[PDB]
Design a protein around this ligand. Structure first.
Ligand SMILES: Cc1c([C@@H](C)Nc2nc3c(c(=O)n2C2CC4(COC4)C2)CNCC3)cccc1C(F)(F)F
Length: 473
């Protein structure tokens, strides 16, 4: 009795499971499938599958376009009803209403179930991935068209649910971001050093207070971390040609990291006087120290990256003068990264909020997953989409997400914020050219051992003494 399901002449989502169309790894977990089998199982009539819905909608762009998805789920929804029996045909021939017994049960046990799973996909799509519709107005047109042409008593509650979500997201992106954290305790006083409040023209590494540099960079990096959406990381989309559209928050995070790291390097090697340069390196290790007190691991490893860089790491005469206890701070920070990040991961998972995780490790691990797993599995001459590959990426993005909920009890200083948002150490140079300049500047200020060490004039007119990293109170 196969003929209860609709035929392949009329419906593409009812062909049998085979080893040529679906591989699996309780609700079953799919390893690989054709897109039709993935859509079918996304909307399967016998059970709901919230883990697969979530993971599919996070990752589908690596195997299917949004417009193709919408077409496929609409096609999924439009199930053909079976032909009436000879007796039902006789009934309507006689002028009567037919009994319709199988038609009624097929509606109950197939059509309605599938259709409510399609509307659930729509709801999850608009609720958690509204960006696809912000990025494509015609996709939003199609969605609203499809949703307003869904008729029926059982469907209309969903149509409401979806329409109301679509209203909220349109209203929210019209309004923009707002202030949505009341401080749950009193934040500490903003710290100031040489630069006076408002006097932004004097803002620099040594002239702002090291505590406040570290706090304001932590607030900034916290917001950047929190703004990354999972799909920005799937498929390596931030390395592809449409990176600026598909990965905006991700690329903001990456470019911030690049600009802060290179700015630290620039501050160091452009201070040619040894003693001033020691005070600069020492101030950066103080900022590191405050990053670690805040559990901004992102900022700790940006300082580490700068201290391990080509231009900076070779500056033996500078590091000789750094106090032993600041050397120990810097050594411990480096040891976070050793052995595949062992101590980092242990500390991450044991602290209480708030923190900023190191973002670079997630990129590294996602790239390894992307490069170490095939896009397709071949079975019997057919290519199936490797869905396990996407699930493994989605699980890494879910680790990201678990820490995106950790606001700091720190007050924003708008001008210091803007100073760090507007860091541009490279200028109009390309990265490679800029880092070649940095390395050449390093060789100038501390030549390779056979050549002697010149002295260089001082460049800072204010005192080099730090105020330290203990706050007021
Ligand atoms: C501690 C320190 C650093 C840290 C960030 N780098 C560092 N530290 C350590 C290890 C290591 O391999 N590295 C560098 C060497 C590389 C490979 O080429 C760079 C990673 C190994 N285990 C013990 C700690 C940088 C500059 C000046 C110092 C200071 F002056 F304090 F000693």
């Amino acid at each position: 009795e196969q003929m209860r399901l609709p035929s392949a002449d009329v419906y593409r989502f009812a062909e049998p499971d085979s080893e040529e169309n679906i591989i699996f790894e309780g609700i079953p977990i799919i390893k690989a499938g054709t897109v039709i089998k993935l859509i079918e199982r996304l909307t399967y009539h016998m059970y709901a599958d919230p883990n697969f819905v979530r993971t599919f909608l996070t990752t589908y762009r690596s195997f299917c376009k949004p417009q193709e998805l919408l077409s496929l789920i609409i096609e999924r929804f439009e199930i053909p009803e079976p032909e009436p029996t000879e007796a039902d045909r006789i009934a309507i021939e006689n002028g009567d209403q037919p009994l319709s017994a199988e038609l009624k049960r097929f509606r109950k046990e197939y059509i309605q179930p599938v259709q409510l799973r399609v509307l659930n996909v729509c709801r999850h799509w608009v609720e958690h991935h509204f960006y696809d519709f912000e990025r494509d107005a015609y996709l939003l047109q199609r969605m609203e068209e499809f949703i307003g042409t869904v008729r029926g008593k059982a469907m209309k509650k969903w149509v409401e649910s979806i329409t109301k979500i679509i209203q909220r997201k349109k209203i929210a992106r019209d309004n923009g971001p707002g202030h949505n954290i009341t401080f749950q305790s009193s934040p500490p006083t903003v710290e100031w050093h040489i630069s006076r409040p408002g006097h932004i023209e004097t803002f620099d590494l040594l002239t702002l207070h090291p505590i406040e540099i570290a706090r304001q960079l932590t607030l900034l990096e916290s917001d950047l971390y929190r703004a990354v959406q999972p799909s920005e990381l799937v498929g390596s989309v931030w390395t592809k040609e449409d990176k600026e559209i598909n990965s905006p928050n991700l690329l903001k995070m990456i470019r911030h990291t690049t600009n802060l790291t290179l700015w630290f390097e620039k501050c160091i090697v452009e201070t040619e006087n040894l003693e001033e340069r020691v005070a600069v390196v020492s101030r950066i290790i103080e900022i590191l120290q405050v990053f670690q007190e805040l559990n901004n691991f992102n900022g700790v490893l940006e300082v580490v990256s700068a201290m391990n860089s080509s231009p900076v790491y070779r500056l033996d005469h500078t590091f000789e003068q750094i106090p032993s206890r600041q050397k120990k701070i810097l050594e411990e920070a480096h040891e976070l990264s050793e052995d595949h990040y062992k101590k980092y991961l242990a500390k991450l998972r044991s602290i209480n909020p708030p923190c900023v995780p190191f973002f670079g490790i997630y990129l590294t691990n996602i790239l390894k997953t992307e490069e170490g797993n095939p896009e397709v599995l071949k079975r019997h001459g057919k290519e199936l989409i490797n869905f396990s590959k996407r699930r493994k990426v989605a699980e890494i993005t879910g680790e990201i997400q678990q820490y995106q909920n950790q606001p700091y009890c720190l007050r924003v200083e708008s001008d210091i914020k803007r100073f760090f948002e507007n860091l541009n150490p490279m200028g109009n140079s390309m990265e490679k050219e800029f880092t070649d300049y940095l390395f050449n500047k390093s060789l100038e200020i501390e030549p390779r051992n056979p050549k002697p060490l010149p002295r260089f004039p001082k460049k800072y007119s204010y005192p080099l003494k730090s105020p330290g990293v203990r706050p007021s109170n």
